[PDB]
Symmetry: C3
Subunit: 227 residues, 3 copies
């Protein structure tokens, strides 16, 4: 239920919160117009994650969903967080590699579908169907990781070595991180109950902090963001 | 009620789904930077339509609304679909004719109002009021079709003949299609019950497929999208 | 409750409505590409405010929220209105002063957080918590007003005198207006009950009309919008 995992929600709230604080301070004296955007996109991610986590901790981001034949606690705020967060992360990778507009809109359009479809599946009352959505959602993710891995990498090979290499790191980091979500979702209480909500929450917590603080850290402390 | 029309929802789900598949494959080997955006915008439309239709078919996109003095099944997913879909269609017409930013924001701003206001009217419990919203919504649509017909046409006359002519086709096609919605809505169960939900669903189904697959077809198979 | 203040909702609906009408007509014969965007952004604000107010008047934008130990009428449509409105107002100030993209995304990202967080607090059932959100929301606002006052002003000093001065006016006007919201919210039925809903509604009404009609008036009637 929504009680014993409060500690993961509390610890995550704190980390995202501190995560925002640091980026804000770190980006204080940046004049480079390029880096400026990077700081904006990257700082906005943990900030949002902060408010969504706090809402899960205080209770607002938790709802109840019946399926299988029981009342299941679903943290919808997770999706609300991701819905705005993932596009930004994507935007970072794109600026860095200088992606085309068509491809950005495609990636972003695909991303909303991944989360929207994911949320839908989390709120679907027919236990069976929940897995269709998971499927459609995961497909969208693969499309995104495909374009990021091959599409972007190829695009980064024309950038100066600092960029090509920083991106590479971020590339591997996102590919590994992003794919853990559909797996965590699948084994957690939202899907095939194989791991308790308490663990599910902890797993997503580590994943969210890594994706919104780690990623930012790796990027914002690189020279790559300077034009 | 929400049962006998399942077949229109199923057939539509299939068409949008196939609609996405084809565009994805067709845009596979496109290198032209212009066409690329076109494929992105146009492919994203049926994809979204796919997920929204599937949700109506599985039951998620259906809700119940009391008014007149009864429980009325309202497919809110239709609006959710249109909310993201219409801006994109508009974006296509704009890129094609090279519209100004002010006019795009205006058209898009007007579009959200058309759908938002339409949805509101679909969820309004006071039977009487439902028609005010329909009115406000239809006004917004007219504003859009006005700008598209005169504003854009004039803008397309400066483009190469392929563009001016392709646009023209799309222009007539959207003007005719878009205006059928406020009429279908008005005579269907969501408004003045003159046609059963079963027909209403079928009518919107034909309209959605034409607007998201036909339009894409006409455009994506034209030379117009190449810079 | 949601009845005696209907007059403020009615009067506001009317003003926003007339507000849109005037801007539409005033921007009819504008050819300047710069001014065009300004008219678009500025006209779209009262239009949205119109639909949201009308929804509060008709009843749709009102909901009930228990907290403190009672049923409290909460006009969520206020937040829905602001959510789309404030970014636009911000966009106006930015175009006028020629702000960077990083700073716009930052301001807009901060703005959504201010409203999103504000709405959350308005729907939070735990009376106590409602004030945390108010706090987080108000912080975001200060961040925005900070950047607008110092950041933008500095940016406007490089524009021609008409712009620098018009902006200045708008600058003082928004700083004074925006900060009245968190105060009105705090003393109204949504926070520390010190003023009845009837007054709260009237206060926000004056504030919304000033922000969406006054601001537009001051700006749209200035030469500043011409490139
Ligand atoms: C700028 C754009 C153009 C912005 C877009 C903003 C918006 C559309 C995004 C929201 C995202 C959506 C996708 C997620 C929503 C999920 C939704 C399906 C689930 C609904 O719940 C959330 C919603 C409703 O709350 C409710 O208010 C109603 C009206 O008063 C009530 O009727 C509902 O019942 C109420 O729901 C709550 O309470 C339920 C409680 O039940 C109780 O539980 C207790 C437990 O102890 C006990 O059991 C009681 O007995 C029992 O009754 C609970 O179960 C429900 O779950 C729920 O809590 O809330 C509003 C969501 C808010 C808008 C999201 C915050 C968003 C953040 C702050 C925005 C920052 C983003 C900016 C925009 C990005 C900037 C950068 C860009 C450039 C990318
Ligand atoms: C990127 C942006 C910044 C993105 C914006 C995303 C978001 C804000 C868009 C959503 C759009 C809005 C406008 C439409 C919402 C309509 C809303 C008013 C209606 C609410 O329903 C939908 C919502 C809630 O579902 C629910 O979960 C709650 C929490 O757990 C519950 O409390 C609710 O009750 C529950 O509602 C469901 O179940 C009801 C069931 O009742 C039962 O019915 C059965 C029938 O047999 C039987 O009778 C039972 O007895 C009875 O109890 C049902 O009646 C309700 O209708 C409902 O099903 O769901 C969330 C919506 C989801 C977010 C929309 C999918 C969006 C897609 C995938 C996004 C793709 C878009 C991208 C963003 C675009 C990219 C391109 C751009 C560049 C343009
Ligand atoms: C383009 C983008 C990518 C666009 C984004 C659009 C979208 C996501 C934005 C919405 C914004 C969100 C943030 C606000 C939502 C607040 C939400 C938490 C609160 C929920 O209520 C609103 C929602 C649901 O209505 C409902 O339908 C459900 C399904 O059928 C029902 O299950 C719900 O119960 C029902 O809720 C209503 O009714 C309740 C009634 O109870 C009754 O009250 C009477 C009183 O006499 C009596 O007591 C009865 O006994 C009692 O039962 C009531 O209490 C509830 O409050 C509610 O009324 O409605 C949908 C919202 C709609 C989408 C917002 C309008 C938006 C406008 C028109 C859009 C214009 C914006 C464009 C996009 C901007 C363009 C420019 C850009 C460039 C910046
Ligand atoms: C519990 C808490 C931990 C959680 C926090 C609560 C949180 C929810 C509320 C905060 C809002 C937050 C969400 C918003 C974050 C936005 C973030 C994305 C911003 C990234 O930042 C990008 C830039 C925006 O661009 P700029 O103004 O154009 O830069 C000017 C530069 O000098 C170039 O000038 P040139 O062009 O002429 O050459 O920030 C502008 C740079 C400015 C010069 C510096 C601004 C000063 C700041 C006000 C101070 C930094 C903040 C401090 C850590 C204090 C924290 C208080 C906070 C809560 C307001
Ligand atoms: C629509 C069409 C796709 C399905 C035709 C099935 C039709 C004969 C209906 C029988 O199927 C029963 C219906 C319930 O409807 P009910 O009549 O109210 O009962 O379940 C609903 C049927 C299925 C459970 C859901 C449809 C399946 C989705 C299309 C699955 C998504 C798959 C992948 C994630 C997509 C990418 C794969 C790509 C590489 C091909
Ligand atoms: C039930 C089903 C029917 C429904 C489908 C399920 C669906 C919900 C999930 C899929 C996600 C979908 C919503 C997302 C669609 C996005 C769409 C808008 C994309 C449009 O496409 C635009 C471009 C993006 O731009 P680019 O990468 O920059 O192009 C590189 C070019 O070579 C130029 O290089 P240069 O600049 O150096 O000169 O697609 C990039 C071009 C790439 C080179 C080609 C990419 C290969 C693709 C992975 C293969 C195409 C897909 C296949 C049909 C397989 C379908 C599987 C799908 C489910 C993932
Ligand atoms: C506000 C103002 C516009 C209306 C003043 C009416 C006032 C005397 C109230 C009496 O009207 C009764 C009220 C209910 O409120 P209740 O007191 O709780 O009972 O119905 C609500 C009143 C009406 C049914 C709704 C207001 C009408 C909208 C303004 C209509 C929209 C018309 C068109 C679509 C817009 C474009 C036309 C353009 C070309 C002029
Ligand atoms: C998380 C972490 C921040 C808090 C640690 C507290 C922890 C020991 C929990 C005890 O606190 C009790 C919990 C309820 O959880 P329950 O166990 O289910 O009971 O209330 C919830 C605790 C608090 C009421 C909410 C957390 C506080 C927010 C971080 C406050 C926001 C402050 C400002 C607006 C932000 C800008 C200021 C900047 C300049 C520093
Ligand atoms: C906080 C930041 C990130 C990087 C969040 C990423 C989230 C995902 C990649 C989620 C993926 C999902 C899939 C593929 C299918 C089931 C539902 C999920 C939303 C968990
Ligand atoms: C799927 C694509 C398109 C082109 C959808 C278009 C939808 C409309 C033009 C809807 C118009 C409406 C009006 C004008 C008023 C009543 C409600 C509607 C939303 C149906
Ligand atoms: C209609 C236009 C404007 C300018 C609306 C502005 C709204 C705000 C500045 C609201 C601020 C809030 C804060 C800071 C905290 C409590 C909740 C509010 C949303 C009222």
């Amino acid at each position: 239920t929504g009680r014993p995992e409060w500690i993961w929600l509390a610890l995550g709230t704190a980390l995202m919160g501190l995560g925002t604080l640091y980026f804000l301070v770190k980006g204080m004296g940046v004049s480079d117009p390029d880096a400026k955007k990077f700081y904006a996109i990257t700082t906005l991610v943990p900030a949002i994650a902060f408010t969504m986590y706090l809402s899960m901790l205080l209770g607002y981001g938790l709802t109840m969903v019946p399926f299988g034949g029981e009342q299941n606690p679903i943290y919808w705020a997770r999706y609300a967080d991701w819905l705005f967060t993932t596009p930004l992360l994507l935007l970072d990778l794109a600026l860095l590699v200088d992606a085309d507009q068509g491809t950005i809109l495609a990636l972003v359009g695909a991303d909303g579908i991944m989360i929207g479809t994911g949320l839908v599946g989390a709120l679907t009352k027919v236990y069976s169907y929940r897995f269709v959505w998971w499927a459609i959602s995961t497909a969208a993710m693969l499309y995104i990781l495909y374009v990021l891995f091959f599409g972007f990498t190829s695009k980064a090979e024309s950038m100066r070595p600092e960029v090509a290499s920083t991106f590479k790191v971020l590339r591997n980091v996102t590919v590994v991180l992003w794919s853990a979500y559909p797996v965590v979702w699948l084994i957690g209480s939202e899907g095939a109950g194989i791991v308790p909500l308490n663990i599910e929450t902890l797993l997503f917590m580590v994943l969210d902090v890594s994706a919104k603080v780690g990623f930012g850290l790796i990027l914002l402390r690189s020279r790559a963001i300077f034009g």
